[model samples]
Target: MTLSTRIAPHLPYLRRFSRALTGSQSSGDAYVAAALEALIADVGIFPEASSDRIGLYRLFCNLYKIAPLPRQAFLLVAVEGFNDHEAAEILEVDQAEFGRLLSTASGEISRQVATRLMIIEDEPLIAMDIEQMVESLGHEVVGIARTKDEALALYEKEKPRMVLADIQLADGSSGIDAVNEILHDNTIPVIFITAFPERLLTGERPEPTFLVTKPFNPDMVKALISQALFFEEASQVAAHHHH
Candidate 1:
């Protein structure tokens, strides 16, 4: 009936997962213990799930509920590691609803961190707002460029971790141009902030591509950025470690 007794078997793996989730050993242990405590208390509801993977998942989900969106990302990816289909089933939802939840939570997680980015958008006000939001989160807005030249110049100098590009650039600029130029110049990540389609629906999508339709949640924007930055950092860190 106690936390240890219930999760005695899962403790080792949960410790590893919690370490990744909380970003530290102490925090991970505390969170894991707290999560297990809650799980143990509610063991009666799903009697068949006790001390099992699903039982652990139920508790972890509960923990994610209380954590800020950022921690939820780690808990989901690191602790659970469920693919889209499996994750949705474990969390109990259809695909569309899963997207809404993931995006919403992702935004919450991103709002807390800083990430360097380049803005290749033509719309002055929206571009400015995105820059301001990025700065407030402690990330540098290396460039707020609209034209081809400015975008290239910033990319050359900064080697930014990611690009926040609009599908339309100033004076009839094109999203594909921005994407091409940056890809050609550097291996930077590009996020299309568009209301329209970039590539038409193909045979099938592995998953929804990163896009923030015009007039979307600022948090979702932030979350999308957070997800991008996380991957960028991961790749860079991985390459560094590899060498």
Candidate 2:
């Protein structure tokens, strides 16, 4: 098979892995863009030795490691649907070596730089799942609200650094209404979830950049949170010393 044929199937998922690895879609897409350019320039660079997905990530890891983020291994295993063995193969390392990387990424995400998070979701079950997931990612679940008034109250009480709101709320309220009120002072990033994304995107004015389609995936939520926090003032810095 030609290189493009082997590679086409994995591009979307590869983008997901890249986005979570980099913490923002723009930056993640930038890296993925670079890798594709490289592959175009030199087909020899493609890893025919491994699975297409693994090969794609092999190239991605090579590019991103030049300025590696701390939580990549964690995102690969936890959010990108890679088992430890597959992740290790993608990184071109042994299982033992990969274990250490995963361990570091786990700590880097949860303990090294934790953030406070708020949920403006109406459904109790969905809210609970998001709470548990974000907590594991090193963010504290400050509060959950099912209405505009409740969302405002929770925001004031939690002082959360970020927000995840479903477009519709209970009490016949709009989550967008709650989010607009909250953002009047707060400048934190938001990830909006709704089935009718077209309703939110009327092209009349600015719209939310992060929107999770209805029937969301837990991994997708994880990637969105990572993208939101990747823009945090503290997270957007050079951590490792350059020689």
Candidate 3:
């Protein structure tokens, strides 16, 4: 079969993988087009292999090395469904290096997609602890508020991308009330902190996707923060492409 015919079946999957990696349809298509142009310029650049699919991916990978090692490697294995050996081959790295890259992807991607955040908690020590965790994860704490009014003021002034709030505030006000007011005209990710997560988690009313209970574990908070940001980033990217 001709080179074009051999490569045709792999193009769609490659485009999808590219779009996922670049976080946009246009950018990913551009990169894939560039790779095709490169292949046309020098036919011999394509890998010599029985598995044309792997060869196509290998060629595309070489062209799109701008992404960090962890992301590229992780996506190859996780999203693209390439095995460890095949992903390692596509990345031109040994299995050991590929393992390390894959291992770091979760932590690296989480930290890489940092955002400005606002913290609303009544207790000073808990607020500080949350702030420290946020900073350690590469996110910025724009402001810390202990009451509904303070939270609103800080949010208006600083415009944080995400919020971590406790149910009870210093002024005997409800954090739920503060969040509802802040979200009146804006939409952002919010994680409610409460000793009674079950109360908020009831199916009776609109509920938050993210929640942290009192006596929180740092790791759980970190994981939830990353998940919240990940979804938020995905939604923003999707909206951008649609717009």
Candidate 4:
């Protein structure tokens, strides 16, 4: 099979991954173009052991290493939805090395955009657990609320930059309602933490960009928090440019 034929199906996705990694369309395209140019010049650069898609990503990774972000692991596993094993293969690293790289990437993100956060959860233990995680990420935990009214009150006082909220509160009030009320005037990022992420995932209403299921993984939460802040700042910058 031809190289172009093998690479055709993965181009769009690779572009998407590159854009997210670089945080700019132009830069992302430039890197991708460089990778393809290199591939065209020397087909031997592509990995023989891997599939076409993996080989393409491997080639891109080689070029991308020239300007590193420590985020390729995050982009590959979280954004590109590659499994740890696949992502490791793409980066030409073992699983243990990939894990360290992912951790460092997540930590780098936290350091880049540390901000105040609020938790709206009914369960004391769960809220505390999340609070500890948030603190470990170098973010301030403004407050924790167990009800809609409490959440609103905390927001009014603390004015947190982000929120991690549960679906149902102790007083049977919906975290969704609290978040909606808070968002009425502000545009902070909100991540819903619930047992039933599907409740907010339904397409009938404006869906959350960030959601974590109950029994959450610490690494996943850290990654999402970083992503939420990363995109929020990116969009704000874009808006600033537009204005």
Candidate 5:
């Protein structure tokens, strides 16, 4: 496939990451536009440490860093699915320092934000782990559901402000379906956990803006949950300022 075909699918996801990092679409898209311009000038600009998806992110980080962009090092690993090695490579920082970045970002985010959270997972142990992770991040576990019906029921009853979900649910119903059902009535930040992210990361229509793969670290979940809450808070502030 040509470069355009290879890169088109990842643009929307990149946009989501950029918006979360910058707290606004306009700022994020401007950087994205700049990245594309840079890419056009130099096809070999993005590094090859990971997939095409990650290369796109690394390139954006490079361009964004010059602006001294909002500290996106944390979001790269947590929200964009980069390992420490790769994220650090993109951030031009050493591995040890990147670990500190993760800790610093996680601590700062945890101390600053809190919100109600819902988890939809089939495995009892995983759900418990997620519940504890969010709690440590200073968020409340409003509800945990194993199946689609239970998820939907708990979502309505608990009225959580954020959702964490797995693709395959307890009753063989899709967690995506459960989330879709809930989102029909409410608009909240949603983070999905899956073994097969490329299946959903098609960048076709609309997909979950935040996702953590299976076997994810607590820091990744912590960072993403915090970023979600951060973006929501930023959005509310901007909206109120306008009115």
Candidate 6:
């Protein structure tokens, strides 16, 4: 749809939509910008879209698809209007796994160094490094899981306060599933450590499961983890009062 320069004004709309999807303002902007570049580079793909409201949606959809988590998130909410269960199909995962992704959609994020964490990854170096990072922040590394089974086993054994999951596990194609299993019937927090930014699909989230992409920054990773742990609303409400 040959995007006219007029499409630039829609950046704010895209940014807002991105914020709703990922729950991180900075992350949202970065992704929205990435989406913009992709669309502008090939504005002619949707020849019928022609830089109008329909074009905006089309462009947004394109960006949503390529931008990783945003796509998965959007399809579930906007297109299919399905709950987490249906969203899992589009995400190529099962209900339990999808629950984890949907549950960790954290908001009101902050960074604190005292959170207890569960580190789940296949690589020895990364796992060790993740443990070190946790300790360095004056926090505890409760347990480490090398596989989906190990992750599940440890969650039951250690009852870790939070989870640090790696999508590319030693024994599975979707470690995200393991994360889901843990989160499905429990309230524990989890953060994904993965190589792809595309995993954070927007259309399928509630709190927008927090992510720490691979080639990670110990400091930034710490910050994100701390934020997820610190700002959770689930922790704030006193149990008896709600009932």
- The lDDT, on a scale of 0 to 1, for candidate 2 is 0.72
Stretches off by above 4 angstroms in model 2 are 66-70, 112-115, 133-140, 147-159, 166-185, 191-243
Q: Which portions of model 4 show Cα errors greater than 4 Å?
A: 1-72, 75-83, 89-104, 202-204
How does each model score on lDDT?
0.60, 0.72, 0.77, 0.76, 0.75, 0.60
Residue range 1-243, candidate 1, lDDT tens digits:
764566565555455444444333455556767765765677654324423655576556555552344345434543344454555544655877767777776555656545578888887889988888778678888888788888888888987777887777766877657667678746765666776532311212221234555654565466556555555666689889957
lDDT of 6 at 72: 42
Worst 10 residues of 1 by lDDT: 200-209
- Predicted candidate 5 versus true structure: per-residue lDDT over 1-243, tens digit per residue: 977788878886677676657654466666777788888788888677567776788778767661122247777766676777887877777888888877777566667467888888888888889988888667888888888888888987889888999999867678887898888877788888998766754434455667677877887787667666777776678879967
lDDT of 3: 0.77
Model 4 Cα lDDT, one tens digit per residue, 1-243: 798888877776676566556544466667777888888898888876457888888888877772244577886776566788888989988899999987888677667467899999988889988999898877999999889988889999999999999988888677888899989899888877878654553323355656666777776577667766777877789889967
TM-score of each: 0.53, 0.68, 0.57, 0.63, 0.75, 0.54
Candidate 6 contains a number of clashing pairs equal to 19
Residue 73 CA displacement from its true place in model 4, Å: 3.2
lDDT score at residue 181, model 3, on the 0-100 scale: 92
The full ranking of all candidates by TM-score, starting with the best, is 5, 2, 4, 3, 6, 1
Worst 10 residues of 3 by lDDT: 200-209
TM-score of 6: 0.54
Highest TM-score against the true fold, candidate = 5
Tell me the deviation in Å of residue 212 in model 3: 0.6
Worst 10 residues of 5 by lDDT: 62-71
Query: How displaced is residue 24 in candidate 6, in Å?
Result: 9.0
Note the residue pairs that clash in candidate 2: 23-227
Evaluated at residue 182, the lDDT of candidate 6 is: 82
